[PDB]
Each structure stands twice: as C-alpha cells, then as structure tokens.
Amino acid sequence: PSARYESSSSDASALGKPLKFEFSGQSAPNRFLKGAMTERMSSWDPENLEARGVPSKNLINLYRRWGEGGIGLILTGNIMIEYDQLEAAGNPIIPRDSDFSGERFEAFKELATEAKKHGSLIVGQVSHPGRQVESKIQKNPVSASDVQLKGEVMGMTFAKPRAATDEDIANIIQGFVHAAQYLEKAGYSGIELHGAHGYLLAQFLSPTTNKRTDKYGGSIENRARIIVEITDAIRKRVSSSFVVGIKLNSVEFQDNGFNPDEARQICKILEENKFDFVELSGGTYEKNAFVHQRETTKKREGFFLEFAESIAPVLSKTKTYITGGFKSVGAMVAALDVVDGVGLARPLAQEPRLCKDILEGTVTGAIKQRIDENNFILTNIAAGTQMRLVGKDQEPIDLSQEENMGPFLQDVGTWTEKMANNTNQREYGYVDITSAQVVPYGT
C-alpha cells in the first residue's frame, strides 16, 4: 500500500459543503479546487503557427478522469490567446481571431463536457506569457516595460521585451475577451485570469517589471488597470452567470511596499470588479516535516503569510482559495478558518481521485511521494508525467514506492536527453514512461 501524509483529524465533512459564488450565482459543489497545471498535451508544430493548440484526445481524457474525481472546481492549465505567445510548446490556444466552431472549438467543448459530466465546475485558466515566452517561440515579446527575463536556470532563454503600446494592450484585452466568449460558448463554467508566476498580468502587477509612467504604471490601481479593463470588457460579452476568477501570487507583491493600504485596494479591486473568487498562492499553509534546507524559501513563505492574512479576512463577496502544499485533511480543514476553499495541484496529478477518497473517508492524506517537496523542478516533472499517463488512460505511477523511483528517474534522465537534443523543436510534453508495468486507469 502507498505511504501517505498523516492527518491530525479524520473529519473532512466541512470540505464537502458547496460554495456559492456571489456574482455569477453558480456554486462549486464542494470546497476542493484542482489547481491549474500546464499539461503540454495540445497540438504542437515548431514551424507552423495555426497547427498549434488544439486539445488532444489524451488531454480530453485527462479531464474526463478528473471529472470523475469528486472535485468542486477544476481549473485547466493556462490557455494561450495567440499562436506565438506560449508558456510552452503543447499549450492549448484560443487564438484571438478564431471562430466559435470547427475542430479546435469542438475539442475545447469536448474537454469541458467531460470535465463537468459529473457536476464539477470546469474553469479555463487564460494567460499571456508576456516577457516569459522563449525566444525560439517569440523573438519580440511584449511586457509592461522592457525588463528582460535574464539567465533562466533551465535550458530556455527569453528575448528582451518591448513595452506594450496602447494598441498592444487593446489586442491583449481582446484576446482575453475572445477567450472568455469562446470558453462560454464551448460550455465552460468560467474563466480564471492568470495573474501569477511572472506571466503578463503579473508583469503589470509587479514594480520590478512595470516601470511604466502612463495610466498602467505606478500605483497599485494603475498596475491593476489592465486586469480591470479585461474584466470590464469580458462583462460586455459573456453572461453574468459565467464565473470569473483570478490567481494571485504573493511573489508579485513581495519586497515592494505592500501594506494594509495596498491590501485594502486589492480587495476593493477584486470585489468592485465582481470576481467570484481569488486563488491565493506563493507559499504553503500546511508545513512540511523539516524535510530539507529552508534558507532559499524563507523570505517567500514569510511574505505569503502576510499576503494571505491581509487579503482573505477582508474579502466577503469574493470567495478565497489557497493553493500550495496541502496534503492532509487536518490542515485543509484548518485552512477553512481563513479561506473558503483549498486548492490542490501536485496531489491531484498523483491521485486524480483524491477528493472523492477524502470525502468518502477512505484516506485522510495524499500519497507521500519519495521526492523532496522543495525540489520544485522534480516535483513539477513528476506531476506532468502523471498527467501524461492519465491522458493515455493509464493509472499514475505510485512514487511513494522505492521500486518506482528508480525507473522514473531513469526516464527523467532520458527525457532531459531528448529535450537537450531537440534541435528541430518537434519534441514537447512531459516524460514518456518506459515501464511495461503501467496499468489501465483505475488499476
């Protein structure tokens, strides 16, 4: 049997309560959110723009299986809005000039149909990468300003961005608006704006990347203006029942004059613009059991506490989720003293049915995988690899088993080899498991 994180309590009943969003009027049927995870399982062509971004049959199957997992609110991984503005090869893409019909549309529709078949909400996360698109994909990226993303530790470089012109901003807004309309037409419950992880919206929010002197730079209200203009323009086009959320990360507001006056203005912006929910990330609520050195995470985690405790208690109409580090029922229930719901990402790649199993009382903690939780690169590769398995309708590999760690690491090595020799850029996605001992999904 799998080793699992221990829990201080076995009462999960609070997590099963529906959550009513005040603006859309829709309810998530429980307090669980499946955090967005870039799947890299949409079509890719390094030499042809339009051939990219169509959700594959395997991607649809991944959301079919998550749709059976008892999850209140399922987020997609980030969806792009232009063919050459990609977080990664294999991203899904809703191009600004695409029709609400045809092969691409029916693929997006099928993903939503499978995700919501058993009553989950399915919310499409939409993002523009801004300065954080690789030069091999975009030679002329756009940002709030011209601050180049320098020296990435991974084998990926980024070109110096240009400051967005007024027309650039109009095209970005309309790409988000078109994506919202498209998701609505394709049957999605809503849209989540990706305001985190240094992508375009975070580039406007962060003073390190936003040096603008016009109405989009300076004060927190000005730095958030492009977000407000997006939601204003979305509301002119989609039904008021369409859910609208945003993911925010403490890192964007860190070491940069955050205070109660700022936290209050952020909450004012969220509620006056009718966000159904904000998903707060940047640290962990549940602490890991002294597994590894914490020098390199201390300043991020301390600010996340200040960030989340300055935002969540102020909001009332807008609902709050915290995503990051949740493993066990005891910690998830404790977090409901501060926020409305809990987001899980990596645990739901390793265990797509964990929420169902928690609510039925079969487990009280996620599988305790044999990978250090602070080894971000490796835990991310593991989660992407599990999504790829479920896409193939195979069961996730139990990484709590010492037996499975060896072959997994061997395949990670082989995959890094393939991506290093990817001169032609045709390869994409996460690790392909070599093991013949994979089993059909559901054992």
Ligand SMILES: Cc1cc2nc3c(=O)[nH]c(=O)nc-3n(C[C@H](O)[C@H](O)[C@H](O)COP(=O)(O)O)c2cc1C
């Ligand atoms: C493989 C992988 C892909 C992810 N992709 C996205 C993404 O597309 N958009 C996003 O906002 N966060 C993404 N995340 C971050 C997660 O949503 C989540 O915030 C983070 O993993 C912390 O939650 P956890 O401790 O439950 O995994 C990704 C994380 C992983 C591991």
